[PDB]
Each structure stands twice: as structure tokens, then as C-alpha cells.
Design a protein around this nucleic acid. Structure first.
Lengths: 52, 437, 187, 67, 84, 176
RNA sequence: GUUCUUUGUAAAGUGCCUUCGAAGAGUCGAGUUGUUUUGCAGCUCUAAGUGGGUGGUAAAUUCCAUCUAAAGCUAA
RNA sequence: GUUUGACCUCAAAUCAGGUAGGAGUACCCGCUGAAAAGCGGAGGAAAAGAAACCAACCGGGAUUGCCUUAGUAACGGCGAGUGAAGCGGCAAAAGCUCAAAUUUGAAAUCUGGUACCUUCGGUGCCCGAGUUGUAAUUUGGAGAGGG
């Protein structure tokens, strides 16, 4: 037959995350890979392959 | 006599020079020639006499005289009740072993088990550990080089027995070898069940040397650090020492309050002991200063007559706190006003204060006078990675300090709102710490 | 045609049969004005396009090419978050202040845990109608998820009242009928 | 009495057909599908308790050669 | 010829279960609901005891120790639902 | 990530939601052809652990087979149909009393993403022509039974091989 | 071998400390049928996570060993 | 708003670019199969191949092939006869890649078109593909974050 769903496990709420994963450095500082792409464009403009 | 007079290896000499030690305390000056002689010992000494270093020197002498590989053995084994005392003994022992060649480690219930497991798989030539986690590591970790046991020490068997780890200790000693093992143990007082473990441990016949209102402030767990900050600003230009539990929270609160630019001295086991001595000297001579310290680093040294004793964290030994405030009052003719922070789960401690029969004064809190820096705290933690990690470390070591606490009737982790604790540390979401709850 | 015949015969065979209650939480979804204000919120937090990204890159790169190293200062980018594993990744920290969930995904099973997962994690989820409308606010074709974590101080008060609005309109209205087996009525 | 016949995972076909013949012999015996562990044996008691048998029989085949 | 102790290599599968995977499995449990023989199985516990329940579950399964875990799991479900 | 949710939910097949989706989709696929192109993997996690990537050069076919194995024959059908494609792998999705359904990942060695990107350029080798025709796929190696273990002995084709060992005689220049 | 250039807070490696530390399900397996001499295939049923596979071992409410299946490539 | 548009699906293209077939087939790999034939699929080799291995030792260490094990074990109207494998010696030696937790301070990825250029390609621009996940990093022998 059919019957409504039991929510035994949802009703207890986790006050904490699952994983104790340490926070990375790059989440706090300006993005590095952005800056590498910036310096790529800088090298292309120094070679004049990209016009300002 | 002196430490530098006695026969020692030169890196141990460099170590003792850099720890600032020249002279000997008298009971340790007594026990050191039997410590070199190779006899078992028990000993009555005050907590913090330097009695860690007392065994640390001939243990490293034994490891120097044997010169065995890290794969070869473990040898020196240290049993100590408190996670905080374990970290203090470890932090003293680090530079000592660092000038030496051998290996040093930690086994603590509440640490990451795969970490301690991999360190045991590598092998550790000097183990410092809590009694409860040792049964897990001896029964469960495979391939761990156990058969050597060059020596073994117990510290404060009163505190093991008062926690109640003595049956675990009996199972440990029944796992432990005896013939290669020598046993040395320090305990300020003694009981019969202490002496029963002593009769099992001490392999030769040993020679042994034997030598008021409180403030209480009930606060919610979120606003208590803020209220500490507010009360510390209001009582600026008054020297005050704050008692903590975990050295990480000591270092983090010190770095935080120095980032809020009010002058704060730190005092903890991770602090280098010459720097520790410098900080204590500067606090004692400066006479208007903020001192952040743990419980037992404060226990390890005498205290100047202070404007305030503030105890933020839960105590290591509440009985020693009751004796400590009494000896603080009777020693200091200048009035030292003692307070402890409380959480509304902790009021049973109060009736144990009513078991202590000393008077008690409730110190009230105005909700209007709140420093309101918590948004700046959260913006700071979202900004600074370094402060973010130190905040997480103070939080982690704080919760593991609750885990390592004896009086469950006074402190249950199930009672505590970790959301408010994180907001006190300044996290809007509590970070995950791998803690049995 | 065949495909018109099947796409009309689809949604008949579904409603004719009993759907499990972990489905039909979908289409019990957000009403008109609240979804409208939610979109007004998230269009304030559009992510940067590839063209706008490359344009700012060319600006700062021409600056460094002159050099003319102007300053080193930028607060953070704030935007919606839209990668599905990234959306789940922002939960279980928790970091998701609001989550929008598309009702229509053809592999529905990609999505079905997310209401219960934000339920147990306490995250204020809301089921939105149409993943194309998610893709429009995130410069994709479809997105099927929409997480939002970081908000300026100008918008933070609007955020909290939107959360309370959703928890009133979604969590109170549809919670018991979420447990019930939907459909089953023939066509 | 009720009876139970249990084999291990080890089977040769000539090693197998004997168990068929024995199941043909005793009707109060049963012909349960084979157990996983040749080593753990206490569970079988529970199995006999779940089959209400008064004598249980177990066949261990080591290395497909020894019975 | 005397001894040497190797560092014993234990697979990371054999270490333990994480908090994450227990959360994953238990969160899948209430969402998935019960399969129909599990719907039978909870009722068969409640009606005719764990003896007949384990026997029917072993009949549904192949082996016996899995039937133990299945019956114990449905007992955990009954304990999680009925008292709570 | 969300793939662990999909895997653990995927292990509970006769659970109510999965059999609901299964029962809808079997009729829905019954409307369509024996073989056709699926827009996306219905079980993406299973496709990932079989090696699917979502880029050009990855084609997903859905194939219907009547109840060799059924899976290998299902691979052979789409191998015969899309000859330009190379069959990566396949997996079960759904079944009926009349038919089982499989979802097959094929990879084109003509597309320049596949001809570059050296994680997958090996499949451009002409030794990888029709792996299902030689049973070089996963289900092919299972039905050939090629692993390590004493449980693995001389079986069918290898049996003829060791029949070959009994059939040929080896002689040296100096007789031993 | 010469010769021209390549850096951008670029990429990597080793020791120590600290905090973590997630893996192949209609699969494993069970029964039956065919086929082979134990696998394979079909049909039905169908799991676990200090898990699982496999083998010896017993002075026995045993211990120990040894690998990580259900994804892939690889010259001679 | 009876309007307009996102998608999604499905069609159509004398649209652009590619690719499949057939022959041969000594060797190889699958399928079928009698008293081999046949079918299908490749290459210069193919297959297999980096242990859910073998062992029980003072352990060994991907696969392949040779000598030995050995006409032994085992099987078989235990009749006809069938018929291995571990180890050892040698030849040759080579190891690697995914799939699981976030880059979220910026999809960082790629096909295609076009303009040039030093063209088994490169650069630029623009369409697209792609978050229902393309890159970097990590495959337990750990590894990652930091310091």
C-alpha cells in the first residue's frame, strides 16, 4: 500500500558540517589564476599581439 | 648543585642552556642521582616544580647511551592524566629531543586516530600519552614496536586515580614488560591504590624522597569572551591574569587582543620557556599588564599579588583551585579578587563551591554595556586566513579540553550550544571538530 | 508525429500513477511575488560574463602593460553559485544562505536529496520553477541549482526578510503535504 | 528430530553430488544454500534454531580436495 | 634470520567509516523509503517475531549474516520511528 | 560532491522512488526505438566511474535488448550501428520482462578534442577498432573470464588454447 | 655543439610540525537451468563498510596470513 | 500578455568538416559448431598485463615466452587413457591514468569559423560546447591543507 513518509532523520539538525577539511589559503586572498591570466595578457601586449 | 655541573651530552647541555636552566631545585637535585643510577622511584613534589625536566634529562641520557634507531624501539613512555599537562610536558620535551637525535610523539584521546596511528607506524622514541587512549593504541595498532620498554613514568597518580583510569593502568601494566622496564613516578600525595600500582610498577626496591569570597559570573557561552574583553578594557591599568585550558586559545586570544592593540602577555606550553620566563618577568615587573595563561602553566609558577584572578575556562583540578584561592588569600596581603566565568549549564559547580563552604559573590552583567565588536570579529575572521586558522584551533582545542574533562556532572558537551561557542570564537557556523558527542 | 505524441503522453502516465512523496515536493513551489522578489534579488548578484571578465582582464593588463600599477585592492567578487557539485559543496560547511532548486530536471535523481539535505542542514532552500530561469540569471542555458552565500551590507537585511518570507511561505505551507503520495488520479 | 545439511563454498562436482544423495536420503534433513565462512560456526546454531533442527551437519571443503 | 618488523599496510577501506558516509547512507535511508519486501519485513517483525523475520529475510537474501544485518537494520528503523 | 548521494541512492533499486522512475522510463523508452541517442547519462555517476566526460566526442546511446550475454550483445548492436564511433563502455539502467535497457558510452576518435587531450587519445589507435567485437570491453573480459586467481582456470577459449598446448609438439635442434 | 630567447611573487621536490584524510551495486553473493571441467551465460533473488575477497591455522566464544574486485592504458 | 521570450525536445538542410563498408586473412581475438567448416573483428604483431596474486616459507612479487616441475598432482564404465599448477633457472623487463570531499577570490577547459603568422601547428577575434562539470591537483606505495 501507501503511507506518508517518516522524517525521523531530518528532524534532528546538524549544528556542524560533516568534514573537518581545513580551509584553503586561496579562499581569502585575491585569486591567483586570474593573475596568471592577467600576466599572460601582459606578455601578449608586450609582444603587441593584443592591442589595448 | 647545577644542571651544567653534572655529566651530560653536549646537545642536552645546549638544550638546558637555551631553556635558561642553570640551577637545580632541591628535590630534583635529590632524585637525579637515583635517576642516573637506574633505580625505580616514587616521589612527592609540587605540581610545576620542574619535575617534568627532572625525568626528561636522564631519559634522554638513556636514549643517548643506547643510540637506537627510530625503527628500533620506543623506550621512554610517559603517562600523564591531563591533555593540557600532556601538551605542557610535550612542549618542554620538544626542544630537548630536538637537540637530541631521537623521536618524540603524542597519544591523546581526542586527537586524530590515523595521525597517531601513522606516527606509531613510523615509530616514536619517546611517547607522552593519556592513560585511556593507550589501551586503544596497544590493543589496536598493529606492528607497533612495543617489546622494548626501556623505561616508564607515571605523573600524579592521585589525578589518574581521581579520574579513575587505574583499571586501565592495570591492563596497561599487564600488557607492559617489566624486566627491561624501570618505573619512575611522581605524585604529590599518595593513597593505597596508588601504592598498589607502585608495587606492580617499581621493579627494584625504591628509595623515595618526600619533601573568602569568590566572584562567579554566569554568562551565555557566546557573550562570555566579549564580556571578558569589556571587563578587561574597563580594568585597564590593572594587572590581571586570566586562566585558560588550552594553549591554542591562549595564543589566539593573545594575538586577537594584541590585534585590538591592548597590551597582552601570553603564557602557554607552546611558548618557548625562555620567552615564557621573559613574559612572566615582564608581567611581574610591569605591574599593570594583561596575562593570558592556562590553568597549569599558572600552577607551575608562583603568582604576584594581583588585582584580579579571572578564570575563563573550566578548571583542571577544582580541589586545587579551592586550595589555590585560599593560599592566594593567605599569601597575598594585597587583596586579590577571584572570579570565574560561568555558563548556565555549570551551576552544579556552584554547589560544589557550596561543598567548599567558602563564601561566594554573584557579579552582575548589564546587557546595555556590551562592546559590540562581534561583527568586526566576524569580518576579521572572514578576512584573515591566519586569524581564521588560529580561531579554529582555539575552538578545536577548547572542545577537546571539554572532552578531556573529568567532572561530567559539571560539564557535558551535550549541554553546550556549539553555535554560541563558535560565535564567541567568532564563527557564524561551528567548524567541524572530530569529537565524540 | 511520434515525439509530440510521447510528450503529450508524458505527464499523463505520471499523474495517473502514485508518485512517491520524495517527489511532488516539486511543483509545490514558490508563488508569484516571492519568486519575483527572489529574481530581483539574484539579478543584483549576477555573475560576471566571459566577455565582462575578459574585458576587465584587458583593462588591468593594459594598466600593468603601461605599469601604471594602479593599486592592489579589490574587496571580493560576490555572485550566485550555480555548479551543482559546487552547490552541494557549499552545503555541509554550511555556507548556503539561500538555495533555489529547479522543479524540472530530466534526471530528477540528481536533485531529490537536496530538499532533505537542506532540511537536515537547516539551509533555507526553496524550490524554484524552471531551470532555464536559473540559467538566465547565471549566463548558462540551464542551471538547476542556485546557491547564494555572500551578500553586501546593503542587501543583507533584504536577505534575512526574504529567508523569513520563504520559511513562512514554503516550510509552513507545504511541509505536511510533502509527506503525502501525490498523483495517482487517472487521466 | 529435524536435521540440516550445510556445505562450504568449496565444490567439485563429484564432491557435490554426494550432498544431493544425502539430501535424498534423510527427509528431515534440509538442503540450505552454502555458508560463506568455513571458520565461523556458532551462527549455524542460530540457523538450526531458525530451522528447529536437533542435529545439524556441516561440510567443509578445503582446497577443493579435503572434505 | 633474527627478526625485522615491517610496517603493516592496512587498506584505507579497512580503516573505519567516516561521519560523512554515515550521514550519506542514513540520509539515503529515509528518502528511499522501504522496498516492498522491507515493507513486508517490518510488518513481519511486528506480527510474527524476529525468528520468522530472519528466516524470511534469509530466504529473500542468499546468506545468513546478511539476514542478521537486515533484520537488525529494520529493528533500528522501528526504534527510530516508533519511540521517536 | 553530489556523486556519493547518487551512488548510495542508486544502490537502493527496489526503493519506491527508483522503481517509480524505472517504471516511468521503461514505458517512455518503449515508445522509442530499439537503439537511439540519449542526450545525457541517466546515471551520470556510473558513467563517470566507467569513464564518461561531458564534452564533444562522447556519444551516449540507449539500447534495447530482448531477454553470449545480453550486455555484450547490446554493445555489439551499437558497435555495428555507429562504426565511426569507438565503444568505450556500457552499463545497465532498466529492464522489463520483454527487454533489458542499457546505456552505452561511445567515443569518436575523429573529433579534435579526442585526438588531443592525452588522457583519451589512445582510443584513436586502430588497434581499438571494435573492442566489443573482440570482447575487449569490461563485459567482454568478464565473459572471457580474464583475471588473476586459482578460481580462474582454463575456460572456454583458453581451453582451446591449452588444447593447442596438447595439439602442438616442440622439438629442439638437440633432442632433449 | 653553437645561437636566440626565456620571471611570473611561476612550477616542483626533500625533512619536521599541525589539521584533515572521500572511492567502482542489478554488482558481490544465493538458487536454478544450460554449457564447460571449475568458470561462463540465462532466469529469479539480491548485500556490507573497523568493509569485502582468499588461504592455512587451532591447546579452540581460534588466531594469523594476504590482496582490494565490480573503471582504463602500457613497450619488450 | 490573445503578446513576447527563454529553454527543452524533435525534424529539415545539394550547409561545413570528417568517418563506416570491400579485398586479403599465415599469425591473433571473440561467437557458433559437427562428422574442421562457418561468422565477426584487428595489427605488425594481436592478446594478456601492473594482484580482491601466489604461498605458508628465512616468504615471493605486472604480464609474456623457453627449460624444468611432469607424464607428476588430479580426473577417468579410476576403462580407453585424459592431463595441470606453485616453486626454480632463463629471455625480456616499465610502469602508469580515471572515478571520491569546492577554483569558488572569478570555466581557470575545448571544438569550430575568420584574420594573419615561422603551418602534423601558433596567435588574435567571434560563435559555440560546457556547471546535469570541461581544466589544475590527488589514485593508497596514500594524499591534501597549511606552517
Amino acid at each position: 500500500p501507501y503511507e506518508p513518509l517518516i522524517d525521523w532523520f531530518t528532524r534532528h539538525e546538524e549544528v556542524m558540517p560533516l568534514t573537518a577539511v581545513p580551509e584553503p589559503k586561496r579562499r581569502f586572498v585575491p585569486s591567483k589564476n586570474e593573475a596568471k591570466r592577467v600576466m599572460k595578457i601582459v606578455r601578449a601586449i608586450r609582444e603587441g599581439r593584443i592591442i589595448p | 648543585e647545577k644542571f651544567e655541573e653534572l655529566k651530560l651530552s653536549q646537545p642536552t647541555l645546549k638544550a638546558i642552556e637555551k631553556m635558561g636552566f642553570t640551577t637545580m631545585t632541591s628535590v630534583q637535585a635529590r632524585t637525579i642521582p637515583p635517576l642516573l643510577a637506574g633505580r625505580d622511584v616514587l616521589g612527592a613534589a609540587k605540581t610545576g616544580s620542574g619535575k617534568t625536566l627532572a625525568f626528561l634529562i636522564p631519559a634522554i641520557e638513556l636514549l643517548h647511551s643506547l643510540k637506537f634507531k627510530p625503527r628500533n624501539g620506543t623506550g621512554i613512555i610517559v603517562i600523564t592524566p591531563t591533555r593540557e599537562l600532556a601538551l605542557q610536558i610535550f612542549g618542554v620535551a620538544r626542544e630537548l629531543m630536538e637537540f637530541h637525535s631521537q623521536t618524540f610523539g603524542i597519544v591523546i584521546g581526542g586527537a586524530n586516530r590515523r595521525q597517531e596511528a601513522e606516527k606509531l607506524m613510523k615509530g616514536v622514541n619517546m611517547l607522552i600519552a593519556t592513560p585511556g587512549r593507550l589501551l586503544d593504541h596497544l590493543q589496536n595498532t598493529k606492528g607497533f614496536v612495543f617489546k622494548n620498554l626501556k623505561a616508564l613514568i607515571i605523573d600524579e597518580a592521585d589525578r589518574i586515580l581521581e579520574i579513575g583510569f587505574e583499571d586501565e593502568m592495570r591492563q596497561i601494566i599487564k600488557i607492559l614488560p617489566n624486566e627491561d622496564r624501570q618505573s619512575m613516578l611522581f605524585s604529590a600525595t599518595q593513597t593505597t591504590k596508588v601504592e598498589d600500582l607502585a608495587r606492580i610498577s617499581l621493579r627494584p626496591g625504591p628509595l623515595f624522597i618526600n619533601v573568602l569570597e569568590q566572584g562567579y559570573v554566569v554568562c551565555d557561552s557566546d557573550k562570555r569572551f566579549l564580556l571578558l574583553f569589556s571587563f578587561l578594557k574597563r580594568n585597564q591599568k590593572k594587572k590581571i591574569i586570566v586562566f585558560l585550558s588550552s594553549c591554542n586559545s591562549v595564543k589566539y586570544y593573545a594575538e586577537l587582543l594584541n590585534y585590538i592593540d591592548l597590551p597582552v602577555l601570553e603564557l602557554h606550553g607552546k611558548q618557548k620557556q625562555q620567552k615564557r620566563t621573559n613574559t612572566f618577568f615582564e608581567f611581574c615587573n610591569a605591574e599593570r599588564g594583561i596575562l593570558i595563561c592556562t590553568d597549569v602553566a599558572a600552577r607551575g609558577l608562583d603568582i604576584p599579588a594581583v588585582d584580579w584572578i579571572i578564570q575563563f575556562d573550566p578548571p583542571d583540578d577544582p580541589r586545587d583551585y579551592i586550595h589555590r584561592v585560599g593560599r592566594t588569600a593567605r599569601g597575598t596581603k594585597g587583596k586579590g579578587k577571584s572570579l570565574m566565568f560561568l555558563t548556565p549549564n555549570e551551576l552544579g559547580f556552584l554547589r560544589y563551591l557550596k561543598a567548599s563552604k567558602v563564601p561566594l559573590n554573584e557579579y552582575e552583567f548589564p546587557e546595555n554595556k556590551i562592546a559590540n565588536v562581534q561583527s568586526q570579529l566576524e569580518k576579521l575572521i572572514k578576512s584573515n586566513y591566519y586569524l581564521h586558522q588560529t580561531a579554529k584551533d582555539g575552538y578545536r582545542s577548547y572542545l577537546q579540553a571539554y572532552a578531556s574533562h573529568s567532572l561530567k556532572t559539571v560539564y557535558q558537551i551535550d549541554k553546550l550550544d556549539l553555535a554560541k561557542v563558535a560565535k564567541s570564537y567568532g564563527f557564524p557556523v561551528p567548524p567541524k571538530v572530530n569529537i565524540t558527542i | 508525429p511520434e515525439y509530440v505524441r510521447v510528450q503529450r503522453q508524458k505527464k499523463i502516465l505520471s499523474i495517473r500513477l502514485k508518485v512517491p512523496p520524495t517527489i511532488a515536493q516539486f511543483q509545490y513551489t514558490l508563488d508569484r511575488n516571492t519568486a519575483a522578489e527572489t529574481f530581483k534579488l539574484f539579478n543584483k548578484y549576477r555573475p560576471e560574463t566571459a566577455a565582462e571578465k575578459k574585458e576587465r582582464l584587458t583593462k588591468e593588463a593594459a594598466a600593468v602593460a603601461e605599469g601604471k600599477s594602479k593599486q592592489d585592492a579589490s574587496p571580493k567578487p560576490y555572485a550566485v553559485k550555480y555548479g551543482l557539485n559546487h552547490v552541494v559543496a557549499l552545503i555541509e560547511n554550511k555556507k548556503a544562505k539561500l538555495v533555489l532548486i529547479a522543479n524540472d530536471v530530466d534526471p530528477i535523481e540528481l536533485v531529490v536529496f537536496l530538499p532533505a539535505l537542506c532540511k537536515k542542514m537547516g539551509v533555507p532552500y526553496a524550490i524554484v520553477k524552471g531551470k532555464a530561469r536559473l540559467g538566465t540569471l547565471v549566463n548558462q542555458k540551464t542551471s538547476a541549482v542556485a546557491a547564494l552565500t555572500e551578500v553586501r551590507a546593503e542587501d543583507e537585511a533584504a536577505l534575512a526578510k526574504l529567508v523569513s518570507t520563504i520559511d513562512a511561505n514554503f516550510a509552513d505551507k507545504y511541509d505536511e503535504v510533502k509527506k503525502h503520495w501525490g498523483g495517482g488520479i487517472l487521466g | 528430530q529435524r536435521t540440516l545439511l550445510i556445505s562450504s563454498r568449496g565444490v567439485n562436482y563429484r564432491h557435490r553430488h554426494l550432498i544431493q544423495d544425502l539430501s535424498g536420503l534423510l527427509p528431515h534433513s534440509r538442503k540450505e544454500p552454502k555458508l560463506d565462512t568455513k571458520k565461523d560456526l556458532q551462527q549455524l546454531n542460530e540457523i538450526a534454531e531458525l530451522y528447529n533442527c536437533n542435529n545439524v551437519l556441516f561440510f567443509e571443503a578445503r582446497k577443493h580436495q579435503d572434505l | 634470520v633474527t627478526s625485522m618488523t615491517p610496517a603493516p599496510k592496512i587498506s584505507y577501506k579497512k580503516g573505519a567509516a567516516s561521519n560523512r558516509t554515515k550521514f550519506v547512507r542514513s540520509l539515503v535511508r529515509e528518502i528511499a523509503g522501504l522496498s516492498p519486501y522491507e515493507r513486508r519485513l517490518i510488518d513481519l517483525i511486528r506480527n510474527s517475531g524476529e525468528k520468522r523475520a530472519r528466516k524470511v529475510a534469509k530466504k529473500r537474501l542468499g546468506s545468513f549474516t546478511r539476514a542478521k544485518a537486515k533484520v537488525e537494520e529494520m529493528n533500528n528503523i522501528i526504534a527510530a520511528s516508533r519511540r521517536h | 560532491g553530489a556523486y556519493k548521494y547518487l551512488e548510495e541512492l542508486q544502490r537502493k533499486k527496489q526503493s519506491d522512488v527508483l522503481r517509480f522512475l524505472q517504471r516511468v522510463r521503461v514505458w517512455e523508452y518503449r515508445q522509442k526505438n530499439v537503439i537511439h541517442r540519449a542526450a545525457r547519462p541517466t546515471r551520470p555517476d556510473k558513467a563517470r566511474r566507467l569513464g564518461y566526460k561531458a564534452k564533444q566526442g562522447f556519444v551516449i546511446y540507449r539500447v534495447r535488448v530482448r531477454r553470449r550475454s545480453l550486455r555484450a550483445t547490446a554493445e555489439e548492436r551499437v558497435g555495428r550501428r555507429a562504426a565511426n564511433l569507438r565503444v568505450l563502455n556500457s552499463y545497465w539502467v532498466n529492464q522489463d520482462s520483454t527487454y533489458k535497457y542499457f546505456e552505452v558510452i561511445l567515443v569518436d576518435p575523429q573529433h579534435k578534442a579526442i585526438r588531443r587531450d592525452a588522457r583519451y587519445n589512445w582510443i584513436c589507435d586502430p588497434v581499438h577498432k571494435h573492442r566489443e567485437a573482440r570482447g575487449l570491453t569490461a563485459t567482454g573480459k568478464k565473459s572471457r573470464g580474464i583475471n588473476k586467481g586459482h578460481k580462474f582456470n582454463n575456460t572456454k577459449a583458453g581451453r582451446r588454447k591449452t588444447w593447442k598446448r596438447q595439439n602442438t609438439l616442440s622439438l629442439w635442434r638437440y633432442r632433449k
